[PDB]
Amino acid sequence: KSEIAHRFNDLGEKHFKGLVLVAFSQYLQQCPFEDHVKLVNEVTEFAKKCAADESAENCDKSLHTLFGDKLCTVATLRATYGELADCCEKQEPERNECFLTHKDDHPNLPKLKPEPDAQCAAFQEDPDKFLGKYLYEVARRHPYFYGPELLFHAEEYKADFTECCPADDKAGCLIPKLDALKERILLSSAKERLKCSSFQNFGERAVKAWSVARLSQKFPKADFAEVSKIVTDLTKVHKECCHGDLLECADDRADLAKYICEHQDSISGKLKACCDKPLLQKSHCIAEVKEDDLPSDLPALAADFAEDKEICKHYKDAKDVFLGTFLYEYSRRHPDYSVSLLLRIAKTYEATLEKCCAEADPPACYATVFDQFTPLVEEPKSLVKKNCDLFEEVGEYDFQNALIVRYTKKAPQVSTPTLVEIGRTLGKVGSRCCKLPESERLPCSENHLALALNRLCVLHEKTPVSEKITKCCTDSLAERRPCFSALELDEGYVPKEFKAETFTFHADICTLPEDEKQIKKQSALAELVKHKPKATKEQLKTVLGNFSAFVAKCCGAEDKEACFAEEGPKLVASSQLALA
Ligand SMILES: CCCCCCCCCCCCCC(=O)OC[C@H]1COP(=S)([S-])O1
């Protein structure tokens, strides 16, 4: 009858408002905070009016009609959101689609600087407005951020300030917490972005396949009914969120967490803790829940998936249920494999049955299918061993550098700041994953890689620079990582013209905290490869060694700039000779 009254009644005012603020923030990233609050308050007002007389004027309209209408009262300002104003001339669903198409994945807004004194005051004059502003700042930086999850993170941001503002040393309590919160936001956005991109680029099947694999790993005692259903509902949840239907997304998410906790014993022992919790914390806990123990009754698989006479029949009748079942069985027993590996393994099973079921004598053809998996397993296992050995030997910073060189050689057309971000991010994956118990390293490493590579692909969607990057980003979700891995130095590239000033340092660097000095040197590293792309990893290491020495010397001088001005250019010329 009235959809806006329904969702208002289901969600409650705080959540309704949060979710609407998040939605507007993602659709209209460039819009000031003030306009968004008015916009939310007005829509919220309308909802209440609709909740008490659902037959009032326009209470029967769809949400996207109401929300778009509303957005379009402010977005018409061409000055401030150019493209988006032509979205406003379209009726739904074209209009929504247009808005989605024009979301910015890299608006490059000012970095979020915690300010413990001024923020604690804001927190106290008006906490709801202060929370709203976190939602605003995060949402607009991350326009496919999981909606309801951002609300949960807003409760943690509040918790942080509630525990720190009254205490004596504010920044001491408060800054590490907020830096840790920022990890979790970055990582979570990257997780959700991967979901929406898989919808965009590959469709629903790709998402279900991914979800079946991962949910089976997580809930290996659940039988296939439970997994299947969960997958069906979680896919529908994320579909709705990716498509900007936040309110509907949050209702369906609540329904699902309720189901999962009513069927706790038939899904996983580990959900106990998650289920004796409130809505948002509950949902969150389920979504990040540890993997359950393996059951003692897992079936032999070969008996059914290799040896059985009746496979081609069991497969032609309902290939996706049959494959799903294969995928579920292989996945529940292999928490030690990455999700993408499990999918390569299933595409290989599928491929093998297409071949063998269209052949004279099929069973003799597919009797060795499980033997075709051994090489798919061994490649990433060894890749992870190798990256983890290198990381443990030399550490985060030099490991990042090595990846900066790897990726700059594969894609020297990418902008320096992006290649630095990638390499740094991937080194951070090294620090997360390589310390884990050995069987957990493959999945930690590839699943995180998938996210970083998707970030790079998304950036490439808006600023394309390399056919190689396009080729890897679009061929196939399962084949992404191995495809990036196989890129070798782009031989087409003409070395970037030497600009001495790029490699020339100054005293200003001396102020910077360690990790921003690092970024500057690593930028220079990427630029070093751009100009000398055949230089080996170790020539670059030595030259970078000499750069670091020199920065450290000159930063410790009486006259820092005289030291830089004198030595800097000698270093810059000589280091070109060292990269032949
Ligand atoms: C209605 C609920 C039914 C849930 C079970 C069905 C899920 C589909 C499982 C199919 C598995 C096929 C193997 C596979 O990995 O294919 C999906 C791939 C195809 O290319 P990508 S982009 S890697 O996704």
Residue numbers in the entry: 4 to 583
Q: What do the paper's sentences say?
A:
As molecules of highly lipidic character found in the circulatory system, cPAs are bound and transported by the main extracellular lipid binding protein–serum albumin. Serum albumin is a three-domain helical protein which binds up to seven medium or long chain fatty acids (FAs). Here, we present the detailed interactions between human serum albumin (HSA) and equine serum albumin (ESA) with a derivative of cPA, 1-O-myristoyl-sn-glycerol-2,3-cyclic phosphorodithioate (Myr-2S-cPA). The crystal structures of the investigated albumin complexes show a different number and location of Myr-2S-cPA binding sites in both proteins, indicating a species-dependent manner of cPA binding.
The structure of the ESA–Myr-2S-cPA complex, determined to the resolution of 2.48 Å in P61 space group with a single monomer in the asymmetric unit, includes only one binding site of Myr-2S-cPA. This binding site is located in the cleft created between helices h2-II, h3-II of subdomain IIA, and helices h8-II, h9-II of subdomain IIB, which is formed also with a contribution of the helices h5-III, h6-III of subdomain IIIA and the short loop between them. Additionally, the sn-1 oxygen of Myr-2S-cPA forms a water-mediated hydrogen bond (3.3 Å) with Glu353 and Arg208 side chains. The latter residues, together with Asp323, create a closed ‘buckle’ over the binding pocket which covers the aliphatic fragment of the ligand. Thus, poorer electron density around the terminal fragment is understandable, due to the lack of interactions between the ligand and the protein. This binding pocket was also identified in HSA studies as FA6 and, comparing the conformation of Myr-2S-cPA and FA in this cavity, they present an analogous conformation. The shifted glutamate residue precludes Myr-2S-cPA recognition and thus binding within DS2 of ESA. Most probably, Val482 to Ala481 substitution and thus, the presence of a residue with reduced size of side chain, increases the availability of backbone nitrogen atoms, placed at the initial section of the helix (Leu480 and Ala481), for the creation of hydrogen bonds with negatively charged molecules in this compartment.
